[PDB]
Paper text:
Trp396 was mutated to alanine (MvBOxW396A) in order to enable direct solvent access to His398, to phenylalanine (MvBOxW396F) in order to introduce an aromatic residue not capable of crosslink formation, and to aspartic acid (MvBOxW396D) in order to disrupt this site by introducing negative charge. The structure of MvBOx was not affected by the mutation of Trp396 to Ala and Phe. On the structural level, the mutation of Trp396 to Phe allows for conservation of the aromatic moiety in the proximity of the T1Cu site, whereas the mutation to Ala disposes of the aromatic moiety and instead allows for solvent access to His398 coordinating T1Cu. The W396F mutant retained affinity comparable with that of the wild type, but with a lower maximal reaction velocity. The K1/2 values for the wild type and the W396F variant are comparable (0.060 ± 0.002 mM and 0.079 ± 0.004 mM, respectively) but Vmax of W396F (8.8 ± 0.5 nmol·min−1 ·μg−1) is roughly a half of the wild type value (15.8 ± 0.4 nmol·min−1 ·μg−1). ABTS binds to both mutants with a significantly lower affinity, but the maximal velocity is not affected. The presence of the Trp396–His398 adduct in MvBOx plays a minor role in its thermal stability as follows from the slight decrease of the melting temperature (Tm) of the W396A and W396F mutants (by about 5 °C and 7 °C, respectively). Mutations of Trp396 influence the enzyme activity but not the enzyme structure (except the replaced residue).
Residue numbers in the entry: 1 to 534
Write the structure that this text describes.
C-alpha cells in the first residue's frame, strides 16, 4: 500500500557502523583478583538529519546516538555498565541474551528516573553470541526503543574465533540492525504513542539509516542480523539487481544463543522482533554486480499479518567490486560446535495462550500490570520445562521471548499448515515467532540463577499493552549464593541512584575513580554469578 513517509533517496547513503564502546576504568574484583570493565553510557536527546532536504528527527539514545555504541566483551570478563538517564522519561536497560541476575536484567518496573543512574553487573559467561541492550521501561518500551535506545553487545570467544569465520567488526563482520519507522512530511519521526495494535513503519533502516548501500569485495562477509523493529517481522533474501526475484543462497551460522551445530543452507530467512541470526554471504560469484537485500511481501508470505508498503520489499544494496585487495582467508566449517542442548524432559508442557482480553494483549488472560495475577510459573532452578506457546489468532503474530534461559525449538504447528521448525531454528534461541495460528513448544533449562524474570511478546506494542508476565526460578532456603539479595528485581541494594550533571561532567563525586572503585568492589563481594562457575 502507498508509502506514507516522504520519498527517500534510496541506496545513496553508506551503511553506518556503530562505534565500539570503550570502558572508562577496570576495577580489581577482590573475590577472584580479576579485572571488571566499568563503562558509562549517558541516555540523552539528540537530533539526526534522516531526510537530506527536510527537517531533523528527535531521538533519545545511548551516548546520544542510534543505534547505541556496540559493546565487544570477551567471555570470562565481567562488566559493570553505569546507564545514566539525562533524558525526559524513565528507562530500564535489558541485556537481551544474558543470564543476568533479576536486579541487573531490566525488569520493567526497575526504572531509572531522569537525573538518576543504575550500575548493571553482567556475567559475560555464556557462549559467544550477538546480544543487544535496549529499553524495557513499563508502558514506554516501544517509544523508548523506537526513539533510539537499542544497541549491539557482542560476546566473543577465541574458540569461535579459531573457526576463521569472516572477521573484523566493520571490516568483514558487519552489524545489520533492522528497524521499520514512519516519518512526518518534515522528516521527524511519527510517534508510536497511541498505537495499540502494531506499528509497522514504512521506512526500512539498517543501523539507523534508511535504505543504505555498502561497497563490498567479492568475498565472504559475516552479517549479524537483529530485528530491532517495534512491530515489523521480515523474510530476508538476497537478489542480483539483474534478476531481482531470484533468491541467492547463503548460510546461517548462528541463532540468538550462538552457533548452530552446522551452517543452515538458506535462500529465505524469517526474522521477527528481537531475533538474531548471523549469516555468511559469499559475494565471490557476483563480482561487478549489485546485490539487493530484500524483504518478502504478502505479510512475510502468509506467516505474518504485517502491512506491506511501496518500499518495505527493499532493505539495502551491496555494490560488489571486480576483485579483492587481500585474499579471503575466512571459511564456514561444516561443523561449528556441539550445541549445549538442555536435557529432554517428559514433564507435561505448561500452556501459554497469547491473545487479547477486551482491547488488552494478554497471556492466559493476564496483563503484566496486574501484579496479583502476572506470576504464571514457579520453576525450581535446575528443572527442564517444555512451554507450549499458543497463538490461536489468525489476525496477529507474536515473537515470544523468555528471559534468563536459552531454549530448543521442539515443534511448530500451523492452523494454516504453513510451516514447522526452520533449519536455522535447529540450535538454541531465546525468541521464537508464533506466526498466524502457530503453536511452538520450546524446551529450556531454568538455570543457573534463582529470581523473578519476565517473558512476553517482543512486538513492543503488544508488550506495552500488555502482553507480558513473570516466572520465578525458585530455590529452597538452604541454597546459598546470597540468593536472598539476588531473587528480587526491586532489591534496594541494586536500585538506581540520583546524580548531579556537574559531577558526571567533571568525573568527580560518586563518578571519581575512588567512588566507582569502592562501589564495584562492594557489588563484587556479593558474588552475583558464582553459581555459574566451572
Ligand atoms: C520467588 O521465589 C523465591 C525463592 O526462590 C521467594 O523468596 C523466598 O520467600 C520465602 C517466603 O517469603 C522466604 O521464606 C520465609 O522467610 C521468612 C523471613 O526469614 C520467614 O519468616 C518465613 O517463615 C519463611 O521462611 C525465603 O527466605 C525467600 N527465599 C529467598 C532465597 O529469598 C520469593 O518470594 C518468590 N517471589 C515471589 C514474588 O513469589
Ligand atoms: C554474600 O555477600 C556478602 C556481602 O557482600 C559477602 O560477605 C562479605 O565477604 C567479604 C569478602 O569479599 C568480606 O570481607 C566482607 O566482610 C563480607 N561482608 C559481610 C557483611 O559478610 C559474602 O561473601 C557473600 N556470600 C556469598 C556466598 O556469595
Ligand atoms: Cu529484547
Ligand atoms: Cu530479553
Ligand atoms: Cu504479540
Ligand atoms: Cu523482555
Amino acid at each position: 500500500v502507498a508509502q506514507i513517509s516522504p520519498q527517500y533517496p534510496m541506496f545513496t547513503v553508506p551503511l553506518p557502523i556503530p562505534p565500539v564502546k570503550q570502558p572508562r576504568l577496570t576495577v580489581t574484583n577482590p573475590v577472584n583478583g580479576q579485572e571488571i570493565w566499568y563503562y558509562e553510557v549517558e541516555i540523552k536527546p539528540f537530533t539526526h538529519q534522516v531526510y537530506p532536504d527536510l527537517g531533523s528527527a528527535d531521538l533519545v539514545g545511548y551516548d546520544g546516538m542510534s543505534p547505541g555504541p556496540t559493546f565487544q566483551v570477551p567471555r570470562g570478563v565481567e562488566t559493570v555498565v553505569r546507564f545514566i538517564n539525562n533524558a525526559e522519561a524513565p528507562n530500564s536497560v535489558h541485556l537481551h541474551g544474558s543470564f543476568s541476575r533479576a536486579a541487573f536484567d531490566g525488569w520493567a518496573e526497575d526504572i531509572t528516573e531522569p537525573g538518576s543512574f543504575k550500575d548493571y553487573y553482567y556475567p559475560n559467561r555464556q557462549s559467544a553470541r550477538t546480544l543487544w541492550y535496549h529499553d524495557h521501561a513499563m508502558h514506554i518500551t516501544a517509544e523508548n526503543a523506537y526513539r533510539g535506545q537499542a544497541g549491539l553487545y557482542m560476546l566473543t570467544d577465541p574458540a569461535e574465533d579459531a573457526l576463521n569465520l569472516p572477521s573484523g567488526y566493520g571490516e568483514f563482520d558487519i552489524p545489520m540492525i533492522l528497524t521499520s519507522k514512519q516519518y512526518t512530511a518534515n522528516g521527524n519521526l511519527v510517534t508510536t504513542n497511541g498505537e495499540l495494535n502494531s506499528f509497522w513503519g514504512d521506512v526500512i533502516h539498517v543501523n539507523g539509516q534508511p535504505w543504505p548501500f555498502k561497497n563490498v569485495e567479492p568475498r565472504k562477509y559475516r552479517f549479524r542480523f537483529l530485528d530491532a523493529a517495534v512491530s515489523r517481522s521480515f523474510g530476508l533474501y538476497f537478489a542480483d539487481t539483474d534478476a531481482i526475484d531470484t533468491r541467492l543462497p547463503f548460510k546461517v551460522i548462528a541463532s540468538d544463543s550462538g552457533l548452530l551445530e552446522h551452517p543452515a543452507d538458506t535462500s529465505l530467512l524469517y526474522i521477527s522482533m528481537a531475533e538474531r541470526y548471523e549469516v555468511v554471504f559469499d559475494f565471490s560469484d557476483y563480482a561487478g554486480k549489485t546485490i539487493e537485500l530484500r524483504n518478502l511481501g504478502g505479510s512475510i508470505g502468509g506467516i505474518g499479518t504485517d502491512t506491506d508498503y511501496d518500499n518495505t520489499d527493499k532493505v539495502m544494496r551491496f555494490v560488489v567490486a571486480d576483485d579483492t585487495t587481500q585474499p579471503d582467508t575466512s571459511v564456514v566449517p561444516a561443523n561449528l560446535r556441539d550445541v549445549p542442548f538442555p536435557s529432554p524432559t517428559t514433564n507435561t508442557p505448561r500452556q501459554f495462550r497469547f491473545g487479547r482480553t477486551g482491547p488488552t494483549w494478554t497471556i492466559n488472560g493476564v496483563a503484566f500490570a496486574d501484579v496479583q495475577n502476572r506470576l504464571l510459573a514457579n520453576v525450581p532452578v535446575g528443572t527442564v520445562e517444555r512451554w507450549e506457546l499458543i497463538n490461536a489468532g489468525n489476525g496477529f503474530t507474536h515473537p515470544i521471548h523468555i528471559h534468563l534461559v536459552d531454549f530448543k525449538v521442539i515443534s511448530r504447528t500451523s492452523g494454516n499448515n504453513a510451516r514447522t521448525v526452520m533449519p536455522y531454528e535447529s540450535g538454541l534461541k531465546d525468541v521464537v515467532w508464533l506466526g498466524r495460528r502457530e503453536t511452538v513448544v520450546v524446551e529450556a533449562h531454568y538455570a543457573p540463577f534463582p529470581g523473578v524474570y519476565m517473558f512476553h511478546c517482543h512486538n513492543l506494542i503488544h508488550e506495552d499493552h500488555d502482553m507480558m508476565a513473570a516466572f520465578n526460578a525458585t530455590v529452597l532456603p538452604d541454597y546459598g549464593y546470597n540468593a536472598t539479595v539476588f531473587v528480587d528485581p526491586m532489591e534496594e541494594l541494586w536500585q538506581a541512584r540520583p546524580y548531579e550533571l556537574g559531577e558526571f561532567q567533571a568525573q568527580s563525586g560518586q563518578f571519581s575513580v575512588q567512588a566507582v572503585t569502592e562501589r564495584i568492589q562492594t557489588m563484587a563481594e556479593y558474588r552475583p554469578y558464582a553459581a555459574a562457575d566451572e
